[PDB]
């Protein structure tokens with residue numbers, strides 16, 4: 001109460017510290033709630049909420065305070081080091097933003113959730129989340145690591161996230177900002193402020209960004225990846241941009257899940273930052289993804305899905321957003337690493353990409369130089385219509401706090417010391433104009449992990465110069481060479497050429513060093 005006053009929040013009468021799952025359930029279904037707070041119970045037993053006007057992140061409202069602690073370390077949007085959302089903020093306008101949130105939260109009933117980001121005591125942040133919306137508390141209780149009672153008794157916050165979603169910033173034009181909304185970070189005060197947007201992904205990726213800053217400065221890879229481990233103890237990580245399959249393909253009933261999204265890699269191996277999973281539900285198939293489907297039950301939190309009058313869910317319905325989601329605590333998945341989400345060094349490193357140009361092969365085993373080249377490129381594409389490219393460095397530039405080369409350097413080191421091999425997987429499109437199936441992709445992931453691919457006869461795909469197999473166990477052979485899916489290889493070539501020029505032009509910004517100039521030869525060549 002006076003502790004809250006120390007944060008700048010006053011006159012808090014009702015404090016819900018560490019809300020249980022049962023309390024959050026009854027908070028969400030309270031029939032007196034109005035607007036975006038309200039939950040509805042679905043027939044699957046999980047509560048569904050609407051996240052409001054924001055249904056995904058708002059990279060354009062993301063600001064980071066430029067002060068002496070961050071000036072010379074951060075990857076800044078305005079210092080010509082290649083395109084990012086780390087936009088500088090003055091300490092003075094930070095203070096204004098902190099007044100808006102702390103006043104909004106004042107005189108309110110507050111939920112206070114204490115949690116960890118990071119599986120290891122040794123590098124984890126102790127985050128205190130403060131919100132006035134029950135489902136937001138529920139989201140952080142799902143997605144972050146839920147402390148022991150003994151960890152709670154000694155809990156000392158290292159980072160404070162104040163979610164003032166209901167407030168907006170009237171002074172933003174004056175202050176040179178993008179909108180009345182804001183997702184701001186202060187590394188001196190160790191705080192994230194959220195204004196205007198209700199969207200929970202802002203806390204999740206917010207703390208991920210903080211880990212991405214802090215970890216590699218002490219030699220630890222910080223990664224936008226899925227991870228799981230085989231009974232054999234073989235660890236795989238799966239990088240990729242949003243919608244490329246990290247969550248979908250790491251939930252494999254044969255392997256134990258470490259996590260679906262955020263992992264670090266230190267002297268002992270790969271560890272999960274999070275305590276939950278955040279699945280996409282657009283067009284969700286019980287048959288194609290039974291583990292994810294069966295995770296949706298009481299304590300899962302559905303977002304933005306359409307719920308029929310009878311409690312049932314139309315999963316195909318994308319009219320509120322295509323980015324429909326469910327969060328659930330990680331133990332809603334039956335086969336997971338426990339009690340601690342971590343395992344050994346990764347020996348298999350998969351770059352997932354959804355290639356809407358329909359050029360790239362379902363799988364190739366990468367050379368050590370292609371591996372960097374592709375890591376820094378960070379390619380995926382969308383049918384926005386109209387194949388639209390995204391090159392996002394390290395398969396997640398949006399969350400990067402340091403220069404992309406700083407993530408590449410540490411990954412390579414970790415990879416080199418474990419003898420790890422890298423693999424590029426197109427989970428996207430063919431010349432069929434259709435996405436390759438979940439089923440063929442799962443069988444390609446098996447072939448990568450069980451050693452079948454490494455021992456396969458391969459040839460070089462031209463232009464991109466990628467080693468691809470002539471056949472694989474459990475995979476339709478026709479799809480393996482991406483040229484087969486067009487009328488003639490010349491129709492694939494036309495597309496390959498357009499795509500290569502995109503990669504070429506994108507990579508240029510890395511060619512200002514030796515090393516980087518040398519990687520161009522690992523790139524697609526016209």
Ligand SMILES: Nc1ncnc2c1ncn2[C@@H]1O[C@H](COP(=O)(O)OP(=O)(O)OP(=O)(O)O)[C@@H](O)[C@H]1O
Pocket residue numbers: 240241242243244245246247248249260261278279280281282284427428435436437438439441
């Ligand atoms: N061949 C395929 N491989 C993987 N996923 C596929 C495939 N075909 C269709 N999909 C669909 O694509 C989506 C993959 O999204 P997923 O949640 O796995 O991505 P992600 O990489 O985890 O994204 P984010 O980083 O936003 O969490 C799902 O909707 C899935 O059902």
Ligand SMILES: O=C([O-])CC(=O)C(=O)O
Pocket residue numbers: 240241242243380390392395396397398399
């Ligand atoms: O645009 C995408 O495909 C996803 C993306 O930027 C991310 O996860 O950083």
Ligand SMILES: [Mg+2]
Pocket residue numbers: 246247248260261278279280
């Ligand atoms: Mg995911």
Ligand SMILES: [Mn+2]
Pocket residue numbers: 224242261
């Ligand atoms: Mn992600």
